[PDB]
Design a protein around this ligand. Structure first.
Ligand SMILES: Cc1cc(Nc2cc(N3CCN(C)CC3)nc(Sc3ccc(NC(=O)C4CC4)cc3)n2)[nH]n1
Length: 269
């Protein structure tokens, strides 16, 4: 189709992300002399049919805060996924390494607003992300933020995906129903967003610090929750806590979350 590229239309410049993100490069889309992100997938690093579905899904995503697909090479391995280049890389290192006089309270609101905007779009369009976290958000000029959207899944909003047993999750971002029953839904993304909020409010501290992963589920079922971060506005902490309701249906929608942050951000200005 229109998205398919020739592998030679692109030239690679630099390895990106120190291994933490696989075979990924800063590249050049030669025609337009445009810097792009390139992800190359060797065989035996993914199942082909599922990769193609993930690529098919990206093709339908158009939102200012979701990484924009530019093209794909999907005939002979290695496969390429080509996207717009986000200059500053992942939001986790960005929060950790930033000048906080510049990346201040109002910028943090701005970043949370952008991300919830992305998630509201996914919510409207029947997708779930299942790995929402600061490390999977990308930052560009002027604190522009985009959620990485390569591995999204089609699921009717409100329905539940039951992942296979033996599936491994990033425990500290993972909702109770997901940890216990492998059940994922837009509401488990809302849970994960709450943790993303905490990462933002703390400028990229590791969540549940010091806590053994084996004990996290048990703590949560007894209504333990991370404490309000130093400096974090109470309304924002309230949003965090609303996102970490035990009952999935008690969590707000992303449409409601984004509106709340919209207000705060425009007010903070
Ligand atoms: C997708 C995308 C990624 C980027 N930009 C960047 C930029 C970046 N660098 C920015 C500059 N610092 C100093 C080093 C890291 N490091 C990464 S690390 C990285 C690279 C790729 C992916 N993911 C993908 O390519 C998925 C879409 C196929 C995730 C993280 N990504 N722009 N657009």
């Amino acid at each position: 189709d229109k998205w398919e590229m020739e592998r030679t239309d692109i030239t690679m410049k630099h390895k990106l992300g120190g291994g933490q993100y696989g075979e990924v490069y800063e590249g050049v889309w030669k025609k337009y002399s445009l810097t792009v992100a390139v992800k190359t997938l060797k065989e035996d690093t993914m199942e082909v049919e599922e990769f193609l579905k993930e690529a098919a899904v990206m093709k339908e995503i158009k939102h200012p805060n979701l990484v924009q697909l530019l093209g794909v090479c999907t005939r002979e391995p290695p496969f390429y996924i080509i996207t717009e280049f986000m200059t500053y890389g992942n939001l986790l290192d960005y929060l950790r390494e930033c000048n906080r006089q510049e990346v201040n309270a109002v910028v943090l609101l701005y970043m949370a607003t952008q991300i919830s905007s992305a998630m509201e779009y996914l919510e409207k369009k029947n997708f779930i992300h299942r790995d929402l976290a600061a490390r999977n958000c990308l930052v560009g000029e002027n604190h522009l933020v985009k959620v990485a959207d390569f591995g999204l899944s089609r699921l009717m909003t409100g329905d539940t995906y039951t992942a296979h047993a033996g599936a491994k999750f990033p425990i500290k971002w993972t909702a109770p129903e997901s940890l216990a029953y492998n059940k994922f839904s837009i509401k488990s993304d809302v849970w994960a967003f709450g943790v993303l909020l905490w990462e933002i409010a703390t400028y990229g501290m590791s969540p549940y610090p010091g806590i053994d992963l084996s004990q996290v589920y048990e703590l949560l079922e007894k209504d333990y929750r991370m404490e309000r971060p130093e400096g974090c506005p109470e309304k924002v902490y309230e949003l965090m806590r609303a996102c970490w309701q035990w009952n999935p249906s008690d969590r707000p929608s992303f449409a409601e979350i984004h509106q709340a942050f919209e207000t705060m951000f425009q007010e903070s200005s």
